[model samples]
Target chain A: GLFGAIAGFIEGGWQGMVDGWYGYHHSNEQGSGYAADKESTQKAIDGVTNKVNSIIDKMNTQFEAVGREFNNLERRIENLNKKMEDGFLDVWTYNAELLVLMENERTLDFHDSNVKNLYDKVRLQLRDNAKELGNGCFEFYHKCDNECMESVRNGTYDYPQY
Target chain B: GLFGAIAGFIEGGWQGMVDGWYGYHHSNEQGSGYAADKESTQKAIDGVTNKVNSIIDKMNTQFEAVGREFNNLERRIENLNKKMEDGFLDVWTYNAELLVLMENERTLDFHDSNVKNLYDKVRLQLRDNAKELGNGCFEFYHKCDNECMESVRNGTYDYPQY
Candidate 1:
């Protein structure tokens, strides 16, 4: 009975291994047929890896672009803040000038009631954008941490060995 | 020479296996230890698994939160757009209000001389906060995509199997 139990468990384990190998092989065949032709498969994988790397590089570039945009927006806001602090424009005057600028720049639509309303709307957008950008940066950080960094440590993917 | 080649190849393959097993076991120990103590090791694994799961769950929650926030912001912008279409507020007025709201909410801090600015220090703080928030969201997304997803696919930790 003990032998039977051991055999049964071993059989179950073997069945699992078979299923895993079948799935693995099937996937490899279906995806790239690499098992059938090792050299060709490796070449194909290399090509795909290069393409993916290029895409990731582009993503990194886009992230930099977004970062620049955010910086520009921040700088512009600072200048405006300085003017306001210096008392160059009263609330009413500031509101009026802002409305005019919005019209010229076409950042806002300008269809409704007054300066206060428009101010509220624009202010909210900036806050929201800032939040979104911060969130995106965080995602990039974690991706590097888990995937890039962990892969390097595990020696699964070749990264800068440092 | 033939016998030497065969011996060298065998040794090399065996060495690879040993290294791979050691790496795997070491990672497992660090992440979720495997030990003779059935109960303690099991509990430790369970705890690690939970921590990983929590990160994933939090990421999802944060993503939803971001979407919701953006939707709300967009709706308000749309309203402003409609008003502008109707020619209710002048362009300058609208822009000024936009700048102010942004300042108050801590989003964008424009340094443009043409824009309205209420408080320089306040605007700076807002900018910093927004940037931080954006970073946080980005990190969460990366964690979900890399670590959480990999764990689920590899069956390294006990996760929902579907």
Candidate 2:
């Protein structure tokens, strides 16, 4: 239940609880509404973290599947190319399979980078937002950002080569 | 001059000065001639930082050029395709140039991700080293790792889409 609620907070960003948490943190005196800045700040930073986590999750899935495909295709191509050179494979068969694998690998490679690029751009934007919005909030959004990215970094399957 | 020497230290990794700094940090009182652990530790961490920096520098260059190319190619493909739909371009020419642009863009996209993957793998290896060797070094190597990655993250190109 606690985990669920925390997940909800991270996902929904506490927009609804603004009123409750707002007044709870400070008095209603000073002729002002309240200084629920901390609650709001936390919500904003949490929102950024949530988005970064989502993007990174997607990146992990892509690199894992696509990166693996790339490596396999690369090795298959090299091995077959060598076999043809050694007269173990026919040119016709090699050409047919090579073209097919090349196209598929190219598409896979493109998507792998494409997804990473998206994560990079989105994370940077989110980091900037968190920095501006979560001012004085330890500014560790990018640190968390790096940690999330490191998941993909530590993923299995060597990154595919061109 | 000072900056140049520091760069030299980072690049060369203090392999030569190892002997000098190695014995200077401790005394001959111990059975071991010296316990210049700190010097070696700093040298090791600095070496990892240096490699990470270099990979990040290459990542910066590749993304700056290739990422930019991907974005430009993406825009061109979209604009030209639209122009063809609007009857401003002939099918033959569009097919011809579209194929060319597609191939170029595909290559660029692959290379961009390829370089990033290389950087990712190498940095992870380096981070692992920093973690094990620089055990009590505040574990800030990954922190520096993230900072180095931020250079590419903060780059000037929009990630290309599929």
Candidate 3:
């Protein structure tokens, strides 16, 4: 009965796997013997930490490139806006330019999705790591607590706190 | 000393606060009396779940808009490309159109960032919840285990596993 209860608690009580296009999911099972070696567990987290750092570096490069392109477009748009207002630009020419700008804007939008996709990937990885570490430690603590409780219940142990 | 060790475990073992442009941080403390009320703790997760659903809805709207704009641009760019190949588009007109396209592309890039920011926000909230739920449950289990252990160590109980 204690094992049954612990199993239930480990399965349902620890993690809530939420649904949607943007949320994260993590496993409750960190595997057997995970609790025995704290150093290896910490090393696992460190390994993920390094992975996240590399992901961030790639994202930064993407962001910078997109930012530079945006700036370049902004200058040209301003120049066109000025030409229109200054009264020398004809209606036909102005319309033609507008059409061209809109086309370029479309390409830039695709670039934006690229960055979004990358960032989402990074978020998923980090969330998984965080949950795994936190969940693993908590489960170990529980087993230890249960061991103490069973001894006391069976009349072969005295309370440590007393 | 026991409290200190537990504190250290809670802080360092359970959650790794990775430093970077994109990562997650989660608190070990679920607050006193949190362990007593499993219902309320689950409620907190439910609340976050609803928030995530709404955020995903918002992201879907943004994605659809961007996707639509992209399709529109694709057709127009193709039209222009065809005209240039057919030799109807003069050098001067093509250059002017190209400049306009680049300028418009810049504005689309900004819109992309808007979506990225919103998605990032959702990731942060969800990771925090995952950590919170997992950490809180683990701590409660540990306390229960400790109570059992203390009784055994002081010679007032029998072995649990046996």
Candidate 4:
């Protein structure tokens, strides 16, 4: 109790005593925390975008490859059919060839349609990319090629109808 | 004597009046920090997994559709090649027809290889799915086939020192 009374005059405040207590001072800035959060947010968004685009590229490769395969096989089959009709005298064998040709036709048609469908899907992916990425991706697609936005802005017709 | 009396009271008991004057209370628990970190870790991992797979599903739908489209269009090319070869006899026209067929063949071959490449990719993707989803996808690929894993497992049984 007597010691407390004497230290009061010299120790004036609580901060004064603690100054010698802690060996070091740590100063943290709020900006660094916000920066970390922003980085995380960007990482998440980028991951989604990249993931989605990679998938589209994979599908496109398939579409192009298969699309070509079917088309090539198609020409070979059709050419054979034409040759048979031109060179073969026996209508019997030719008729049988026609049957085979018809089946080939069907197969060719199915795959061709599939290729076209993939093409449409590719277009859809491009459009949807706009939605997923941001409003900018969306707006970029419809951007003013002819300066439409500029014209609208410059058109001196009392903008807000005062 | 005065100094001793004064210092004794001031320094003897440092706990009461400034209860937290020690400048540190550090009561942080390992569990809370780790739990939140674990949740964050899982959330990021899931973002990549879920996002990547969703892109796959979207791509598959398009591939199936387009593959059919191109195959179907392939079946019907008006003024059939048959009419060209059968109906035209002049060497000049015949040569021209040959040229056309040759071009068609080139188109078909180009796409055929691409399609083949794509087919190879599909197989590759199937294998990788195991890597992404877990060994189950890979194991299942060989599971039903009897004795595939058994011979390898049995042959190497004592080798691993059980």
Per-model CA lDDT versus the true structure: 0.29, 0.32, 0.32, 0.31
Question: Tens-digit lDDT track for model 3 on A81-159?
Answer: 3443343224334644664465345333333332233222333323332223422122222232444433322333332
Give chain B TM-scores in order: 0.20, 0.25, 0.22, 0.22
Q: DockQ: which is higher, 3 or 4?
A: 3
lDDT by residue for model 2 over A1-162, one digit each (tens)? 111112211222235345433211111223212223343345545654665575446444321111122365355434333332333123223333434544444433333333334334433544333322111121223333333333322332122310
Off by over 4 Å in 3: A1-41, A44-54, A57-162, B1-38, B60-162
Winner of 3 and 4 under lDDT: 3
> Candidate 3 DockQ score?
0.02
The digit string of per-residue lDDT tens for model 4 on B14-102 reads 24324221111111222111011232234334644653453343223110101112244655543354343444334334433554564
Q: Give the DockQ (2 decimals) of all models.
A: 0.02, 0.02, 0.02, 0.01
As for DockQ, the candidate ahead, 1 or 2, is: 2
Q: CA lDDT of B93 in candidate 1?
A: 45
Runs in model 4 deviating more than 4 A are A1-89, A95-99, A102-106, A115-119, A122-162, B1-162
By DockQ: ranked, best first = 2, 3, 1, 4
Fnat of model 1, as a fraction: 0.00
Off by over 4 Å in 2: A1-90, A131-162, B1-162
A49: Cα error in model 1, Å: 1.8
Model 3 reproduces a share of the real contacts of 0.00
For each candidate, how many residue pairs have backbone atoms clashing (under 3 Å)?
A: 48, 0, 28, 36
lDDT of 1 by residue, B29-91 (tens): 225321132332344356446544533432231100011112454676445434433442343
